[PDB]
RNA sequence: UGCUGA
DNA sequence: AGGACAGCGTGTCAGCAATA
DNA sequence: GTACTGTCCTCTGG
């Protein structure tokens, strides 16, 4: 998730729309570094043929679109989980009424 | 014997679909009545169509009736396999209550190589395309949205938005990118000419 | 050279405004005033008599421009 | 906040 | 994943007294 | 006022 979203921004930023549903499917259809040079080089293939875009990106549908993506990254995401990589890393912040943040042990 | 007018029904349907597609499709299956087609053809093997393309002989389409009422990632392959075989590239399931969800994901994740579909049998018993409100719809091609983007100075982007799963794109078979006129019957102009990039 | 040819009437609220903002700063009347006092009833003088050297700048919507002289528009 | 005018 | 729910929202138009 | 988004909230799937 995060390679595929980090590629899609990347492409965003120049104006290219199609690319967000073709890294989506690059993606499916295929380590982390694999993960990583399967999208980087279509995006870079991507940002490079399709730069001279970056003033023609400030449109309706490439706004929602990058609105949509980090939406659904900031409300799907980024929920308390055990930890990847040493199970027990769930040093559970929890926030009460602002001006509060409480880690336990 | 309301099982044979449901199978009747969608033949047409999909013989209606297969020629707004562009597949070489005979008059009379086109105007073929009931009592003719039980005369023909009782099973749900032997109502698999195989179509061609107009153009590119080689381009073939294959409908499928699957039997089992909730198709499954092993129906699914065993007729990839008849597809891989026979040296086709296109199919088409007409299904009888869904897909099991993980199945909808697998015929998406099949690349060009293998590009399924599936429409459910309730959706294929009318040809919405031929309600009074739906306008027509031509894929346009290559070489003319590229003159549209000229003359109007477009971007892809910047142009409205048809959806992937609109029902008269999944009808039309039209993947993404591809940019759709349509002609409205207006009441105030006659025949307005819009454009519409599937996405 | 593709748009329309005729003078749309929002360029001619504007050309006669900026007409007469420049006329009322002291610049020359090429269309000889038979005394009167308002800048905006000679710069429709002038408009008549096809007298205006502006250059309306049609914008589209993506940058590209086109510049129309208001001689070379028919005004109606 | 209590009033008032279209 | 079926919910339960807590959470933001706006609301035509100008005057006067009077008082925070 | 009601209806929307949102917000998880955590219950059966590999």
């Known amino acids: ?105 | 014997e309301e099982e044979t007018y449901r199978l009747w029904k969608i033949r047409k349907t999909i013989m209606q679909l297969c020629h707004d597609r562009g597949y070489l499709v005979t008059q009379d299956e086109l105007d073929q009545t009931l009592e003719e087609f039980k005369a023909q053809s009782p099973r749900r093997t032997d109502l698999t169509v195989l179509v061609a393309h107009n153009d590119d002989p080689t381009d073939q389409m294959f409908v499928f009736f699957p039997e089992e009422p909730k198709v499954g990632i092993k129906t699914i392959k065993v007729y990839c396999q008849r597809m891989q075989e026979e040296n086709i590239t296109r199919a088409l399931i007409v299904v009888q209550q869904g897909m099991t969800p993980s199945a909808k994901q697998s015929l998406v994740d099949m690349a060009p190589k293998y590009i399924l579909e599936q429409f459910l049998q309730q959706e294929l018993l009318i040809n919405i395309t031929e309600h009074e409100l739906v306008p027509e719809h031509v894929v346009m091609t290559k070489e003319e949205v590229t003159e549209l983007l000229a003359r109007y100075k477009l971007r892809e982007n910047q142009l409205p938005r048809i959806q992937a799963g609109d029902p008269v794109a999944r009808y039309f078979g039209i993947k993404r990118g591809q940019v759709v006129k349509i002609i409205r019957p207006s009441e105030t102009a006659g025949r307005y000419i819009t454009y519409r990039l599937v996405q | ?76």
């Not at chain 3, 002291?26 to 250059?55: F, H, Q, S």
Request: charged share 25%; hydrophobic share 40%; with cysteine.
């Open chain 1, 1 to 105: 998730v995060i390679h595929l979203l980090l590629c899609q921004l990347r492409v965003l930023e120049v104006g290219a729309l199609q690319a967000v549903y073709e890294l989506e499917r690059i993606l499916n259809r295929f380590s982390a570094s694999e993960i990583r040079e399967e999208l980087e080089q279509y995006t870079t293939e991507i940002v490079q043929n399709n730069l001279l875009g970056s003033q023609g990106a400030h449109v309706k549908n490439v706004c929602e679109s990058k609105s949509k993506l980090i939406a659904l990254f900031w409300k799907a995401h980024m929920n308390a989980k055990r930890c990847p990589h040493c199970k027990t890393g769930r040093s559970v912040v929890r926030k009460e009424h602002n001006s509060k943040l409480t880690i336990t042990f």
């Open chain 3, 1 to 76: 050279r593709i748009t329309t040819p005729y003078m749309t009437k929002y360029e001619r609220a504007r050309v006669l405004g900026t007409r007469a903002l420049q006329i009322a700063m002291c610049a020359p009347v090429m269309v000889e005033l038979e005394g009167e006092t308002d800048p905006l009833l000679i710069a429709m003088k002038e408009l008549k008599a096809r007298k205006i050297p502006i250059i309306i700048r049609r914008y589209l919507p993506d940058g590209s421009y086109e510049d129309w002289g208001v001689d070379e528009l028919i005004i109606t």
